[PDB]
Amino acid sequence: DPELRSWRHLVCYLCFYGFMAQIRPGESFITPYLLGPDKNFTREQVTNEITPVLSYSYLAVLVPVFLLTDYLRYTPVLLLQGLSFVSVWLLLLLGHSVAHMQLMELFYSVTMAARIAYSSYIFSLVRPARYQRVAGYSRAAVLLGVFTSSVLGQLLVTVGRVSFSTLNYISLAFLTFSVVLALFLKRPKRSLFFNRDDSVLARMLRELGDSLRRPQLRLWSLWWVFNSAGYYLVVYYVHILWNEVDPTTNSARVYNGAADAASTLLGAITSFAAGFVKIRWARWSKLLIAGVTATQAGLVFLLAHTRHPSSIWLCYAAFVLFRGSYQFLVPIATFQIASSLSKELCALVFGVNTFFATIVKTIITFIVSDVRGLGLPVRKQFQLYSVYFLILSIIYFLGAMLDGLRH
């Protein structure tokens, strides 16, 4: 039996690791570094040979990491999320070929599949009577981490006047510190699926069938499969589009970290404002999806049809508002799906709704974005993502009227 750690020395260390694991100052400046004068990649080599591997590998490492999170009891996947971080920035700084960058998207996809390895780690580390206070602190330390990583990434690049290569060495110093902090995390002794002391498969699938016939779980899983697949396709490719609108030689004029800190801050407000409307706007739920996906159709169209370099600040605001539109509906989706679900069925449905959204993200990425598919440039393929949300916002508006006229 291992010694119980001090309680105030654990929540302070869960919040300090969860803050320091999000410090990647050169993360918003990966694409202006790859497309810059430091890396020798063509604009069509990044958007068609490199960036679709971020979607392919995330389909390949999604299942494995989702199962190894519960099998290894959530600590070596927090180390694998930090060591694949080091392997991304070791390939940013030392990789030169296109295959070295497709390997970098293989290691970045491990860090995206192991993003739930920290929210589900505190779920199994902390007793349920004490969980909602630590999960409130650690979600505030993660959100403070991804905010100030983009602020420190911006102040070093704009105010500090450091290069993108020096910023990736500052990021590699913060990332080897996050591997050291992940070593001293307290590994749990019982997980949710594979390391409990006991079937679970029988309890879930008997409850999954009865909870699949709810018209709030099906509606917000259909949102999670399709509206979140189009969201990350805009998120992966908007920095390639900002390198087309404002191709500035100076790194201090980039402001990619100022737009990924504003969309973190605006995404925090819309996630806070969604806690007040997740239970009461459940009636007008298809109209809330169609009202936001129509806004997400206009902002991608506004991104796809700005070509003047002085209107790059409109392209930053059309993405901060784009992220804030999606982060408004995620706490509403998280509640309407997981309302009457078991905690083992929350991790199964959200693990499947992420997996089905990654299949849709892989199918579009291969057809629209890959050089083996259509090979479209970032500006033309942002016009197909604009009519992707418009087709989605038509279906949820027709679904709000084909079921709004029944009474």
Cα–Cα distances (Å) from 403 to 216, 283, 400, 407, in that order, read: 13, 11, 5, 8
232 in a known ligand binding site:
yes
The nearer residue to ligand LYA, 145 or 298, going by C-beta atoms, is 145
Cα–Cα distances (Å) from 300 to 32, 35, 229, 303, 305, in that order, read: 20, 22, 14, 5, 9
The nearer residue to ligand LYA, 163 or 195, going by C-beta atoms, is 163
Question: x/- contact string, 149-188, with ligand LYA (CB under 6 A)?
Answer: ----------------------------------------
146 in a known ligand binding site:
yes
231 in a known ligand binding site:
yes
**Both structure tokens of 85:** 């971080």
Q: By CB under 6 A, is residue 67 in contact with ligand LYA?
A: no
Q: How far is the CB of 287 from ligand LYA (least distance, A)?
A: 24
105 in a known ligand binding site:
yes
Q: How far is the CB of 17 from ligand LYA (least distance, A)?
A: 17
**Both structure tokens of 96:** 């030169």
271 in a known ligand binding site:
yes
Q: Measured at CB, which residue is nearest to ligand LYA?
A: 146
31 in a known ligand binding site:
yes
Q: By CB under 6 A, is residue 46 in contact with ligand LYA?
A: yes
Q: Which residue stretch of 29-37, 152-160, 277-285, 287-295 sits at the interface with ligand LYA (rule: CB under 6 A)?
A: 29-37
Which residues from 207-236 bind ligand LYA, rule CB under 6 A?
A: 232, 235-236
325 in a known ligand binding site:
no
Q: By CB under 6 A, is residue 146 in contact with ligand LYA?
A: yes
41 Cβ contact list (under 8 Å, min separation 6): 34, 35, 50, 98, 101
Total residues at interface with ligand LYA (CB under 6 A): 18
Write b or e for each residue in 168-186: b if 16 or more Cβ atoms lie within 10 A of its Cβ, otherwise e: bebbbebbeebbebbeebe
The nearer residue to ligand LYA, 30 or 299, going by C-beta atoms, is 30
The nearer residue to ligand LYA, 50 or 400, going by C-beta atoms, is 50
Write b or e for each residue in 214-241: b if 16 or more Cβ atoms lie within 10 A of its Cβ, otherwise e: beebebbbbbbbbbbbbbbbbbbbbbbb
**Both structure tokens of 26:** 């050169």
Q: Which residue stretch of 105-113, 206-214, 331-339, 388-396 sits at the interface with ligand LYA (rule: CB under 6 A)?
A: 105-113
The nearer residue to ligand LYA, 107 or 123, going by C-beta atoms, is 107
343 in a known ligand binding site:
yes
Which of 23, 34, 152, 332 is the binder for ligand LYA (CB under 6 A)? 34
Q: How far is the CB of 247 from ligand LYA (least distance, A)?
A: 16
* Cα 307 to Cα 300: distance, rounded to the nearest angstrom: 13
Q: How far is the CB of 375 from ligand LYA (least distance, A)?
A: 16
Tell which residues of the chain come right before a gap with C–N over 2.5 A. 198
Question: x/- contact string, 248-287, with ligand LYA (CB under 6 A)?
Answer: ------------x---x-----------------------
Which of 21, 61, 112, 360 is the binder for ligand LYA (CB under 6 A)? 112
Task: Show binding-site residues.
Answer: 30-31, 105, 115-116, 119, 131, 139, 146, 231-232, 236, 271, 323, 327, 331, 334, 343, 346, 350
Interface residue list for ligand LYA (CB under 6 A)? 30-31, 34, 46, 50-51, 54, 105, 108, 112, 146, 232, 235-236, 239, 260, 264, 323
Task: Show binding-site residues for folate.
Answer: 30-31, 105, 115, 146, 231-232, 236, 323, 327
Task: Show binding-site residues for 2',3'-cGAMP.
Answer: 115-116, 119, 131, 139, 232, 271, 327, 331, 334, 343, 346, 350
